[PDB]
Ligand binder design. Structure first.
Ligand SMILES: CCCc1c(OCCCn2ccc3cc(OCC(=O)O)ccc32)ccc2cc(C(=O)c3ccccc3)ccc12
Ligand SMILES: CCCc1c(OCCCn2ccc3cc(OCC(=O)O)ccc32)ccc2cc(C(=O)c3ccccc3)ccc12
Lengths: 253, 261, 253, 261
């Protein structure tokens, strides 16, 4: 019934709030400006990065490489918030432990880029739990292999954010992504699709009720999931370029 | 022979009274107020449920009631196992078959004896200290609502048979000694014991209920109502696995449900 | 009167015969040898145990632990024969149901060791309804905690068997043990002692008539009841050692 | 609070099962034959060692066994690092402190979990495919003989505590989050996490082992047995440097031992 789908949406929203402290609502307030009690420091070039560097990884390498490696560090931090959120998705913890691992392994990147768009506008991205803001232009200016890393993320985010989803929408969308029955090496696919069908029903009703004037938003959101998959494949592609072409190494395992 | 069969009937009734504190006789006294010691607190909605739980002085509700169910089921399994040990010939069987008979028989017996605690309006809970209404249980959010109603439907029809504890003692033994359980290694010795129990049950019913036409057959037909209840229950368990978060049962209940039909 | 005490002794003897198929008389014939139509297989070591193992619980554990657990299994089988015998003791079934349970709970172990002595000689014990014979030496050779388990049973049995009691004596002695008014948590002690007094009278006359040359056998037999209680307490003691000190578990409830 | 502490205990047990294929439960099944799939090949002398190594069909021995030790240690470090990442709050720490916690904690955890694979007679080797006897290990030429015996002495006493995998999951996290490691930059945030883990461990032990008096304290006392094992081991490493020819470890193991206590 409709009530049960709404209860599931609410349960997911409350868990999401518990697992992810920097929510889209909080982040949008910062990107604009409501009661500026603590306006974030803006990193717009090499010198402003230094300015903030010894304001709050530390210095002793190519800035380009410290920024790229900082991306790695934060992304592993994020995996842990996502893993905990996943446990709250009804039916996830009762899946084969091995399939849980696989679901997380191949879903975490798509989720990071989804939630990263909450922290972005067309001109830059919130960093350090929202205390900083790094410009898209500065990131774009970094050394050749590295100057192209965030751009596809920004491009996705501008198009994704024009959908105007809120946290209650995103909570369900994220759960839908995790419960993807098409991940490599899953053992028991049917149970996963069974849960995803329930989550898709809940997502569909959520968007129809929250965005009644946005025609076919549900289909449009599903379409963004090929966008996300492509972004990940490029990012993974890009990580090969690096792995082979650098004197630099010291990655988060 | 007749005196053997009555001695067997009496032995079972004896062990039953020894193994199961809340008998049918005792439940009926309570349900009917023939007792004048402690009338049960009735739970019919969320407000009375809160009061009922907090009456301890002198997660969610649907998963919370499921959890009590689990605890009580474990307690029931312990009682039924003690009863089973007393059935002549049971402990002499292959140990793996004893396990197999308990694994498949325990839930059939749980629903049989639950009927003793039910009327068409509700079920006795907390060693008969509370009464939870059928309508309240029916109300519970989707899947959890579907757990108890089939039991009520069975119980009202089963209770119309008017069996008493002495009848039930032999019927429960019949259920345990079922030679058709999956994975049984030595079927005939079980069937031979069941034959003797069936003989004793038939005699017990003809003597205790002489005016009840074909009661023996009618009771054996309930064994198909029972087997249906259990497969429905196991199905519902798979629904709870998909729609609920952290569940995981007691080690005893997990073993019983492990690779069950 | 004397006749009534003899009638009670006979009633108990007939019930005993009905409840316990392997009687002392049958077992003594086997431990010696009268018309050897089916001489029992002797288990005198690890390899002879295997020999018989796949001759007739099954193999997949420390032999020591399978033997000890076999002891548990058989002892629960024996409780059921004892429970049925108890019903035939005049007045037992009319006692409070709860007291019946308690009498059996705390009496069953003493009875098992009493009747076990019928199946023993100084060198070993009949097993598998008399089809096998396990040596005392082999049992003694088992792993440290377990090699000490049966010895006290053998020690008791050698001294007990020197009393030369027969089944008709034992039937009454067993009934005397069950009707012990000193068991913990009995509700109505007087009715139990009333019945035990009757059984003691019958036992005393039985021994005076059956063993007239055995001076004070009655007193001597009563004295064995502290021996039995001590054996049980040690065995229970020993079960604590195990319960705490083993990777092994899977006991008869 | 209580439900938080049980949720933490459950999360750790979950990650532990995910990060460590050969658990205690699985080692005990093997050591005890409760499994009926593949009984381990026992190595007790040089002749059985040869046969054991050449059973791959379906330098010197003392340095050769040391080398397997090294390979397995590296594999263990990878598993423990994956486990550590899952401990709530760990990846949020200063990266240099994360490294420092792994560097000093890894060997304490290796010997803790090795105990799971040991009885008083020997140790499971090759993902539980082999069993190498304590006496054989004790036999090894001077210095190499001295490596394994202290581990056995610890394991038998540790194993008497009867911890299970769910207990061990939280104890290993306690070990990792030790605020007293040399060179830690931010001690308090580590100590705060360890406080919470200690709370969860205490509750887990009281619930899982209610009859085990002062088990929590007894377990924490093992942390001093463990720290002693590691300093002894590092000492022994310096002996191997003087009495052996070309050794040199894996890059991962060299980093861990680099300027270690
Ligand atoms: C055999 C369970 C009997 C039963 C009960 O029977 C309703 C019929 C539905 N039903 C029968 C068996 C059974 C098993 C079940 O799951 C068992 C399992 O998962 O192991 C779910 C529902 C169920 C309703 C409420 C109870 C409520 C309680 C409680 O003590 C209780 C505990 C906490 C809070 C409120 C109430 C115990 C038993 C109940
Ligand atoms: C954590 C090591 C566990 C372990 C083992 O434990 C015995 C306790 C002694 N011990 C514990 C840790 C440790 C580390 C050590 O050096 C480690 C290092 O230098 O990095 C030497 C001995 C040692 C014995 C034999 C093994 C043998 C093997 C092998 O797979 C093997 C490989 C090649 C040939 C034979 C066997 C793996 C692990 C063993």
């Amino acid at each position: 019934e409709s009530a049960d789908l709404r209860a599931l949406a609410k349960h997911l929203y409350d868990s999401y709030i518990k697992s992810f402290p920097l929510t889209k609502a909080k982040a949008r307030a910062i990107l604009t400006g409501k009661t500026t009690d603590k306006s974030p420091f803006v990193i717009y070039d090499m010198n402003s990065l230094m300015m903030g560097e010894d304001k709050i990884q530390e210095q002793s390498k190519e800035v380009a490489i410290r920024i790229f490696q900082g991306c790695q560090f934060r992304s592993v931090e994020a995996v842990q918030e996502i893993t905990e959120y996943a446990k709250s998705i009804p039916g996830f913890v009762n899946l084969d432990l091995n399939d849980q691992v696989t679901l997380l392994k191949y879903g975490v990147h798509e989720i990071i880029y989804t939630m990263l768009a909450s922290l972005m506008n067309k001109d830059g991205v919130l960093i350090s739990e929202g205390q900083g803001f790094m410009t898209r232009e500065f990131l774009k200016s970094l050394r050749k292999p590295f100057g192209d890393f965030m751009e596809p993320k920004f491009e996705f985010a501008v198009k994704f954010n024009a959908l105007e989803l809120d946290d209650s929408d995103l909570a369900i969308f994220i759960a839908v992504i995790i419960l993807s029955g098409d991940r490599p090496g899953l053992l028991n696919v049917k149970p996963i699709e069974d849960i995803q069908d329930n989550l898709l029903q809940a997502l569909e009703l959520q968007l129809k009720l929250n965005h009644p004037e946005s025609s076919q938003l549900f289909a449009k959101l599903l379409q963004k999931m090929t966008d996300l998959r492509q972004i990940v494949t490029e990012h993974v592609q890009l990580l090969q370029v690096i792995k082979k072409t650098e004197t630099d190494m010291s990655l988060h395992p």
